Amino acid sequence: EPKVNIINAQDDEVELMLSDVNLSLANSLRRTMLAEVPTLAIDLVEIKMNTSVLADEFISHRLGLIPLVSEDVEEMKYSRDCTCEDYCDECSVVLELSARHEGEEGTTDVYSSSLIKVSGPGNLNVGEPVRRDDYDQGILLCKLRNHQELNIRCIAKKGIAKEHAKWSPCSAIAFEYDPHNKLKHTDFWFEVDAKKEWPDSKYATWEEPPKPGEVFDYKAKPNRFYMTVETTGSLKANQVFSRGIKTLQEKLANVLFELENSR
Amino acid sequence: NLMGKRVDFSARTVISGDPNLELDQVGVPISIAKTLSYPETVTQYNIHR
Amino acid sequence: NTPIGRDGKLAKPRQLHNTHWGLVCPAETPEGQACGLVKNLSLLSGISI
Amino acid sequence: RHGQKGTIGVTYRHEDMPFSAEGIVPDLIINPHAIPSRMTVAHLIECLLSKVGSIRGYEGDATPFTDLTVDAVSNLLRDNGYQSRGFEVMYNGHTGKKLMAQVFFGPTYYQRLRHMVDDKIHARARGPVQVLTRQPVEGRSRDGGLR
Amino acid sequence: YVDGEEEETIMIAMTPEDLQTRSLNDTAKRIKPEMSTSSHHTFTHCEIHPSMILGVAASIIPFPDHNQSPRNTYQSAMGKQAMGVFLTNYNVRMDTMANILYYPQKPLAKTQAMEYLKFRELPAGQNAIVAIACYSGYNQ
Amino acid sequence: LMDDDPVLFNRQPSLHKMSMMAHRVKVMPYSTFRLNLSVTSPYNADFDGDEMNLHVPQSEETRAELSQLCAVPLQIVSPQSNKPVMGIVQDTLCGVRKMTLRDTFIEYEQVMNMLFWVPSWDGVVPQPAILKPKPLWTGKQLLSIAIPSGIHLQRTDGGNSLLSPKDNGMLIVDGKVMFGVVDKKTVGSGGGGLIHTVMREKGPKICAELFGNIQKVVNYWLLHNGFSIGIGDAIADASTMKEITHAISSAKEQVQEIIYKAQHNELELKPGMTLRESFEGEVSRTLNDARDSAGRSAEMNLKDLNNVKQMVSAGSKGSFINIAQMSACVGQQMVEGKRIAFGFADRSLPHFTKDDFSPESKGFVENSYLRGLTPQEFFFHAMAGREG
Amino acid sequence: LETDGINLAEVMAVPGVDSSRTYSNSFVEILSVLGIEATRSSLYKEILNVIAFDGSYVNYRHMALLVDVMTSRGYLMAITRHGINRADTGALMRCSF
Amino acid sequence: MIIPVRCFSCGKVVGDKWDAYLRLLEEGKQEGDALDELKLKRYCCRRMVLTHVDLIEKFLRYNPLE
Amino acid sequence: MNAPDRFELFILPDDVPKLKITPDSRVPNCIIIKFEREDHTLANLLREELALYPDVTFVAYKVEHPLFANFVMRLQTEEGTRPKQALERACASIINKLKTLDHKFNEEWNIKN
Amino acid sequence: GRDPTLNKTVKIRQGGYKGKIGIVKEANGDRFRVELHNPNKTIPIPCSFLLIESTHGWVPYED
Amino acid sequence: SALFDDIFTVQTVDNGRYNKVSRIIGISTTNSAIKLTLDINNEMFPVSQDDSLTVTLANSLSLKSWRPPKPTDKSLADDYDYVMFGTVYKFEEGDEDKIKVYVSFGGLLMCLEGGYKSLASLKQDNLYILIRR
RNA sequence: UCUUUUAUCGAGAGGU
Ligand SMILES: [Mg+2]
Ligand SMILES: [Zn+2]
Ligand SMILES: [Zn+2]
């Protein structure tokens, strides 16, 4: 019964019109995509040496906000269900960074592309930071002047966007329904006119404008929805959507299991 | 030191609004609760607790 | 800072006089006991030598 | 920057905040009942002028005792593709539904003071006393007692 | 340079556009005076710019006239308590206490005088997206 | 310290005997106390950075005395004036007014929630008012769910017949609001209202549950309705502005006449007063009339959704002088009852001539805070505020 | 008539004047002329006027108590320190003030 | 102090648009067009980059105590 | 100093059932369900669906306080049907819908690339 | 002292604090108090959950 | 079954203050001295000036916890287009042949003025109003 | 089996 009509599709963002469903299913899909898509991110930092002009937790914060590639993150287990001690191999990805300045004139820029994956469970596609092109340098971590060594070792774990706002995959998700205002779910402020004082939502041509000789129906419900999803490169939009629906299904299946075994 | 001396078992902190309580309740933090105390008598109706 | 005191209330050395146009600031001043006493010069003022 | 002090009450997460029609969520919601009895119109004018200043792409001028009106910012913002008085159609974050009222919306410049609850909370059971009267002592960094 | 005991004897025009009385009718721009009893003036001076009558901590407020003076006072007292960056050598000094802000941002509503308070090379405060709504009720 | 202990609760400086009350404890995380907002009226408190104090009992006798003497429900009625103190404040009030209107209908899936919120509800969903073509409840019903059973109230406001064209007046029969918009004159702190009636009938504890019920319902609904103020709320039309600007012009022109008479010795002297006192009194009457006349004009133009008319019409925050001083003329500035004296010799500011006494020459502000303020007017306003 | 200056013992005795209704507001003279009871009523009337000028409304037994403490020994006993200290209460109750 | 990594309201990464922004400011472009060429349409990500104060330039010129 | 650890918004301790049910008594054939560590997403997705079957007469939910983590739900059908079975049916239906949506989305994607 | 592992550095191998450094602030019995390094908080943890540093690597409570 | 029944002609319709609610004034046709004043929702049963209404008043419909109506049962409602449920809050027995019944429909209002023998049976406590055409 | 220390006087800057 549900339907999909993709309007714009490319690498890291999708623009689609989701039709003939309910409301809280599309809304719950949105909240699920913003809240529960388990991704991967840096979690622990052990600074071996810092002699720069930046406090530590400043750096550890900036590293704490870095997007990593996580296509195969639905196989690695969580941090709480590995029976080892400290950490092993089926629970984390280990990164290391080492940079220094050399000379009297110069100001070396410590970027994020200088992060080198050391050890991780293989062969899966994780660890490497997101790169835009084939030359681009990426995020700017720090800067170093004469004789200022920096050398650190970072742990990376899996998480969701309810424990910290860093494991989140999507940025902002556009969402709307009913452009011409026909259900009368809202009212418009005006000084002279409520028609020549408002913008027209980019989608006011996909549906037809109401007739000025129309009466008021009272059985309709919000039916055709318009949504757009972005990403930061850590995932690709189709994977975000599919993983969202999969997670929601798993949740409902869990609740049903509780109801059944509670007998 | 006689009309207005200093007392014990006091608490001083900042207020905050909350519309989901009933008219005569108050919200005590966890720390102020684990610092303040109350003496209770051991009887036959509460020895288990 | 003007040393007139804190007692005797009075509202004559605390008000803003008409001759304070451009020589002192009208708005910026502390509050409580020293309202109108403590002054802060304007942005284009100067003291003779 | 207009004598409008206030503290944090509760903290909501991203998906619960009333997201606008485009996806922009507000970070700080303040309360209409603080304006009409205090009359600080320069707060609203500041918000609108900052909205336009960010949309067109430059730091907007705002010197007192000049010629900058409100109908000018109205015409500019109306031309750049928005509702002139900065109102927006917004949805509820809980059940995705158009609110029956539009919300004044925009970036303002806020600043954070030096009064923290982590530097004011205090309590005592049985700490030290004085020597002269054997009463509780005066202080906070000494497990003191209240008066 | 004029002082206070001399200011009694002079006669000032507020703006240069007043030194030559004009030859309008608008609801946005304010109503300027008329000088009802003066069909001919002989002005002897001119204020440089009338916004110079303010202080230092009062030149931070944008549009410091669309308000009510106790708010210019409260703001003039709270502008001296905000965190930020006090100097650029916080690493080498050893004072008693010091507060720093991670990511300072210069404002979007600038008064001209700010240019001389170094108030966009050492700002103290952040821009933020603000909405005004009677929401769930925790903001009262 | 655990759940349901009775602790004494205090703010400095305490004045009347309502500033020390015993509350029940409820453990919560984070670092701050919590209050129900309805107890912000005896404490003279607000959440803009204040502090308060908690005192703990010890033995049993004093706990009994706290729970039986210093409780909150036993303090709802003040012996100072034979009238209550705790009422409805802020959003709950504005949106209970917005909820109890005559054109407000709710559909079923929302009424189910709004009825499940009430902690003291029984379990009988009331019938709608439009059984067909579509079940639609109103607001007076889902408000009348909160009120207990057996209450009667009858109030006439302005002498309206029992048909109620302007929806004023109030009729409560057996706890069912027949007609009448519920605002401050009912659920506030006035004598003869709802809180005083229920208090003097069903007991104190029931009145201690009424607040919770109503606040939960109204907060849910207003949460699903929203409310906001804008700059366009403070902008009048071009029709009224020309009317306002003209009313001041004739007032100003009138002033020119009084000065003329006083300078040609043709003015009547008032008993007990010198000539100049009578003159100053006259001017002030004319200008204050003008401000009120202009302010009354702007107030009456406004439409029936200018948010400010809802926050003032609800009586929750503000009153007429605010709309007047935002849309019409700011008006007069006073210093010790008299006006901006002559600090300089025989003139107010050096930007004016000598012996100048037009309106703007001694303080009469002429704009509104939306337009702007000239420097002199700003200076005088700062002077008045400093006086305050 | 509303006149300036007080002199009751003479204005009461003037032909044309309703000598029974003449009233003042310097209740010291009212005590020196009409006794303690009329002074009580006059003092109450004064406090009622003062509080009642600005919309505020007190309930009566409080003000009646206050005005029936000042005049309950034979003369006006003002509330400062001279009028109180001269009573016969305990020494601690008076030294604690 | 230094350019942030994420945004503050939405989370669109703006930690790699400072060098291109400065370089486009050398070529004589305008801030509106220098942001229209960096693809920033929602004015939150725009205000994040338009009002930044780069302070590390100073923090380096003090010779190292280490 | 007094902050709740974040992960306590979705990790269940041992001595807490994920789901608890208690029958209400003021009316017959109505039950109260208590959900741990869930929010508006699950609750609404269930509520709008149960609020459709022509045999369930009253369904609702509420979240008591937003600082904690739970919600409570009231369910009342008619005399013929037992509410628990109806709840299960709704869960199954919603799962079916999600499956169909995923399928058609994947088809449209592989066609659109 | 009243135990041989007080004030000695520790690593946590189970629980929500797994992989975090700490110091034994108080080890009265079975339930220890480890002062975590990472946020300013001292947590209650069972002694079974700790690795202690010794001459060769992180040893369990056999030190 | 039905307590009262008559045919009216809408003469004046007042909007003014509100949008959804209009107030209609009506005089009958077969007899004068029977005036009806009613409030109604516009966007459900819209009215106009100079029309005709078939009005019925009944204390019950059938030929407590409310529940959605089944599509397989019926009543007196399947013959009409606008049904409201209301309470009576004043019953006057004034001078001469005058009776004024004040019925409040859950907030909206209705005043019914008529003779004695015609309205003397409307002394219930809950009334259903039914409107056709 | 507990226990376990915070000078004093004065001055100023602040928050409701
Ligand atoms: Mg306060
Ligand atoms: Zn492991
Ligand atoms: Zn952003």
PDB file of N, CA and C in Angstrom, chain D residues 76-122:
ATOM      1  N   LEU D  76      13.481  44.567   2.734  1.00  0.00           N
ATOM      2  CA  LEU D  76      14.620  43.728   2.376  1.00  0.00           C
ATOM      3  C   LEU D  76      14.316  42.257   2.628  1.00  0.00           C
ATOM      4  N   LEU D  77      13.843  41.935   3.835  1.00  0.00           N
ATOM      5  CA  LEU D  77      13.553  40.545   4.161  1.00  0.00           C
ATOM      6  C   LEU D  77      12.416  40.002   3.303  1.00  0.00           C
ATOM      7  N   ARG D  78      11.447  40.853   2.960  1.00  0.00           N
ATOM      8  CA  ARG D  78      10.368  40.416   2.080  1.00  0.00           C
ATOM      9  C   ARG D  78      10.886  40.130   0.676  1.00  0.00           C
ATOM     10  N   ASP D  79      11.900  40.876   0.231  1.00  0.00           N
ATOM     11  CA  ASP D  79      12.487  40.620  -1.078  1.00  0.00           C
ATOM     12  C   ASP D  79      13.368  39.376  -1.103  1.00  0.00           C
ATOM     13  N   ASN D  80      14.108  39.089  -0.032  1.00  0.00           N
ATOM     14  CA  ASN D  80      15.050  37.975  -0.021  1.00  0.00           C
ATOM     15  C   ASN D  80      14.381  36.614   0.147  1.00  0.00           C
ATOM     16  N   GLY D  81      13.050  36.560   0.184  1.00  0.00           N
ATOM     17  CA  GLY D  81      12.327  35.306   0.166  1.00  0.00           C
ATOM     18  C   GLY D  81      11.871  34.779   1.511  1.00  0.00           C
ATOM     19  N   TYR D  82      11.232  35.601   2.335  1.00  0.00           N
ATOM     20  CA  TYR D  82      10.693  35.176   3.618  1.00  0.00           C
ATOM     21  C   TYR D  82       9.476  36.016   3.981  1.00  0.00           C
ATOM     22  N   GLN D  83       8.855  35.675   5.108  1.00  0.00           N
ATOM     23  CA  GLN D  83       7.780  36.498   5.637  1.00  0.00           C
ATOM     24  C   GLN D  83       8.373  37.711   6.340  1.00  0.00           C
ATOM     25  N   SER D  84       7.841  38.892   6.019  1.00  0.00           N
ATOM     26  CA  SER D  84       8.494  40.147   6.377  1.00  0.00           C
ATOM     27  C   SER D  84       8.742  40.307   7.874  1.00  0.00           C
ATOM     28  N   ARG D  85       7.766  39.986   8.724  1.00  0.00           N
ATOM     29  CA  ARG D  85       7.937  40.105  10.167  1.00  0.00           C
ATOM     30  C   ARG D  85       8.521  38.850  10.804  1.00  0.00           C
ATOM     31  N   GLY D  86       9.275  38.053  10.049  1.00  0.00           N
ATOM     32  CA  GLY D  86      10.056  36.964  10.593  1.00  0.00           C
ATOM     33  C   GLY D  86       9.270  35.793  11.146  1.00  0.00           C
ATOM     34  N   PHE D  87       7.953  35.759  10.968  1.00  0.00           N
ATOM     35  CA  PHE D  87       7.191  34.612  11.426  1.00  0.00           C
ATOM     36  C   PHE D  87       7.449  33.408  10.520  1.00  0.00           C
ATOM     37  N   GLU D  88       7.216  32.219  11.073  1.00  0.00           N
ATOM     38  CA  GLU D  88       7.467  30.983  10.344  1.00  0.00           C
ATOM     39  C   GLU D  88       6.381  29.970  10.659  1.00  0.00           C
ATOM     40  N   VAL D  89       6.131  29.081   9.698  1.00  0.00           N
ATOM     41  CA  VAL D  89       5.313  27.910   9.969  1.00  0.00           C
ATOM     42  C   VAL D  89       6.191  26.838  10.588  1.00  0.00           C
ATOM     43  N   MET D  90       5.774  26.336  11.746  1.00  0.00           N
ATOM     44  CA  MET D  90       6.589  25.409  12.515  1.00  0.00           C
ATOM     45  C   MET D  90       5.749  24.204  12.906  1.00  0.00           C
ATOM     46  N   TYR D  91       6.433  23.092  13.157  1.00  0.00           N
ATOM     47  CA  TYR D  91       5.786  21.832  13.485  1.00  0.00           C
ATOM     48  C   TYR D  91       6.091  21.481  14.932  1.00  0.00           C
ATOM     49  N   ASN D  92       5.279  20.597  15.506  1.00  0.00           N
ATOM     50  CA  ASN D  92       5.574  20.080  16.834  1.00  0.00           C
ATOM     51  C   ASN D  92       6.504  18.884  16.706  1.00  0.00           C
ATOM     52  N   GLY D  93       7.516  18.832  17.571  1.00  0.00           N
ATOM     53  CA  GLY D  93       8.493  17.761  17.483  1.00  0.00           C
ATOM     54  C   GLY D  93       7.959  16.425  17.949  1.00  0.00           C
ATOM     55  N   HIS D  94       6.875  16.435  18.723  1.00  0.00           N
ATOM     56  CA  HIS D  94       6.364  15.190  19.285  1.00  0.00           C
ATOM     57  C   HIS D  94       5.545  14.407  18.267  1.00  0.00           C
ATOM     58  N   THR D  95       4.550  15.046  17.646  1.00  0.00           N
ATOM     59  CA  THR D  95       3.656  14.352  16.732  1.00  0.00           C
ATOM     60  C   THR D  95       3.605  14.945  15.332  1.00  0.00           C
ATOM     61  N   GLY D  96       4.597  15.741  14.933  1.00  0.00           N
ATOM     62  CA  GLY D  96       4.660  16.277  13.589  1.00  0.00           C
ATOM     63  C   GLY D  96       3.383  16.913  13.091  1.00  0.00           C
ATOM     64  N   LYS D  97       3.040  18.103  13.568  1.00  0.00           N
ATOM     65  CA  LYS D  97       1.745  18.684  13.255  1.00  0.00           C
ATOM     66  C   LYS D  97       1.839  20.203  13.300  1.00  0.00           C
ATOM     67  N   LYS D  98       1.227  20.860  12.319  1.00  0.00           N
ATOM     68  CA  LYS D  98       1.316  22.310  12.239  1.00  0.00           C
ATOM     69  C   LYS D  98       0.655  22.961  13.446  1.00  0.00           C
ATOM     70  N   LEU D  99       1.441  23.740  14.180  1.00  0.00           N
ATOM     71  CA  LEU D  99       0.906  24.535  15.271  1.00  0.00           C
ATOM     72  C   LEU D  99      -0.028  25.601  14.714  1.00  0.00           C
ATOM     73  N   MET D 100      -1.080  25.911  15.472  1.00  0.00           N
ATOM     74  CA  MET D 100      -2.060  26.890  15.019  1.00  0.00           C
ATOM     75  C   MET D 100      -1.523  28.315  15.111  1.00  0.00           C
ATOM     76  N   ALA D 101      -0.283  28.488  15.554  1.00  0.00           N
ATOM     77  CA  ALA D 101       0.313  29.805  15.709  1.00  0.00           C
ATOM     78  C   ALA D 101       1.734  29.826  15.162  1.00  0.00           C
ATOM     79  N   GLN D 102       2.062  30.904  14.463  1.00  0.00           N
ATOM     80  CA  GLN D 102       3.413  31.109  13.974  1.00  0.00           C
ATOM     81  C   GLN D 102       4.282  31.691  15.079  1.00  0.00           C
ATOM     82  N   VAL D 103       5.587  31.493  14.945  1.00  0.00           N
ATOM     83  CA  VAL D 103       6.543  31.793  16.001  1.00  0.00           C
ATOM     84  C   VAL D 103       7.589  32.756  15.457  1.00  0.00           C
ATOM     85  N   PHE D 104       7.821  33.853  16.179  1.00  0.00           N
ATOM     86  CA  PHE D 104       8.915  34.756  15.849  1.00  0.00           C
ATOM     87  C   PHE D 104      10.242  34.042  16.072  1.00  0.00           C
ATOM     88  N   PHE D 105      11.152  34.154  15.107  1.00  0.00           N
ATOM     89  CA  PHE D 105      12.268  33.222  15.033  1.00  0.00           C
ATOM     90  C   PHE D 105      13.496  33.947  14.504  1.00  0.00           C
ATOM     91  N   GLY D 106      14.641  33.772  15.164  1.00  0.00           N
ATOM     92  CA  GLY D 106      15.864  34.352  14.650  1.00  0.00           C
ATOM     93  C   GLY D 106      17.030  34.336  15.618  1.00  0.00           C
ATOM     94  N   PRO D 107      18.234  34.591  15.102  1.00  0.00           N
ATOM     95  CA  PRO D 107      19.429  34.543  15.955  1.00  0.00           C
ATOM     96  C   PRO D 107      19.663  35.855  16.689  1.00  0.00           C
ATOM     97  N   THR D 108      19.927  35.741  17.988  1.00  0.00           N
ATOM     98  CA  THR D 108      20.249  36.874  18.843  1.00  0.00           C
ATOM     99  C   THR D 108      21.594  36.585  19.497  1.00  0.00           C
ATOM    100  N   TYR D 109      22.256  37.630  19.981  1.00  0.00           N
ATOM    101  CA  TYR D 109      23.575  37.502  20.580  1.00  0.00           C
ATOM    102  C   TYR D 109      23.449  37.392  22.097  1.00  0.00           C
ATOM    103  N   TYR D 110      23.687  36.197  22.637  1.00  0.00           N
ATOM    104  CA  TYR D 110      23.566  35.948  24.065  1.00  0.00           C
ATOM    105  C   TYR D 110      24.935  35.801  24.710  1.00  0.00           C
ATOM    106  N   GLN D 111      24.985  36.117  26.002  1.00  0.00           N
ATOM    107  CA  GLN D 111      26.206  36.069  26.790  1.00  0.00           C
ATOM    108  C   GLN D 111      25.923  35.407  28.131  1.00  0.00           C
ATOM    109  N   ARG D 112      26.952  34.778  28.690  1.00  0.00           N
ATOM    110  CA  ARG D 112      26.809  33.843  29.801  1.00  0.00           C
ATOM    111  C   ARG D 112      27.574  34.377  31.007  1.00  0.00           C
ATOM    112  N   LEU D 113      26.887  34.512  32.137  1.00  0.00           N
ATOM    113  CA  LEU D 113      27.424  35.205  33.297  1.00  0.00           C
ATOM    114  C   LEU D 113      28.277  34.273  34.156  1.00  0.00           C
ATOM    115  N   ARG D 114      28.623  34.751  35.354  1.00  0.00           N
ATOM    116  CA  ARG D 114      29.502  33.993  36.234  1.00  0.00           C
ATOM    117  C   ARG D 114      28.787  33.436  37.458  1.00  0.00           C
ATOM    118  N   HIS D 115      27.484  33.192  37.377  1.00  0.00           N
ATOM    119  CA  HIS D 115      26.726  32.650  38.501  1.00  0.00           C
ATOM    120  C   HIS D 115      26.323  31.221  38.161  1.00  0.00           C
ATOM    121  N   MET D 116      26.943  30.261  38.838  1.00  0.00           N
ATOM    122  CA  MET D 116      26.747  28.844  38.572  1.00  0.00           C
ATOM    123  C   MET D 116      26.217  28.150  39.817  1.00  0.00           C
ATOM    124  N   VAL D 117      25.315  27.191  39.617  1.00  0.00           N
ATOM    125  CA  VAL D 117      24.686  26.486  40.725  1.00  0.00           C
ATOM    126  C   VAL D 117      25.707  25.582  41.405  1.00  0.00           C
ATOM    127  N   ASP D 118      26.775  25.234  40.687  1.00  0.00           N
ATOM    128  CA  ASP D 118      27.817  24.374  41.232  1.00  0.00           C
ATOM    129  C   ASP D 118      28.678  25.142  42.226  1.00  0.00           C
ATOM    130  N   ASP D 119      28.485  26.455  42.284  1.00  0.00           N
ATOM    131  CA  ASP D 119      29.194  27.314  43.221  1.00  0.00           C
ATOM    132  C   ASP D 119      28.273  27.941  44.257  1.00  0.00           C
ATOM    133  N   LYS D 120      27.102  27.361  44.500  1.00  0.00           N
ATOM    134  CA  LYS D 120      26.129  27.921  45.429  1.00  0.00           C
ATOM    135  C   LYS D 120      25.411  26.874  46.261  1.00  0.00           C
ATOM    136  N   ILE D 121      25.380  25.617  45.812  1.00  0.00           N
ATOM    137  CA  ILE D 121      24.689  24.578  46.563  1.00  0.00           C
ATOM    138  C   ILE D 121      25.460  24.270  47.838  1.00  0.00           C
ATOM    139  N   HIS D 122      24.728  24.025  48.923  1.00  0.00           N
ATOM    140  CA  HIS D 122      25.367  23.816  50.216  1.00  0.00           C
ATOM    141  C   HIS D 122      24.413  23.094  51.156  1.00  0.00           C
TER     142      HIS D 122
END
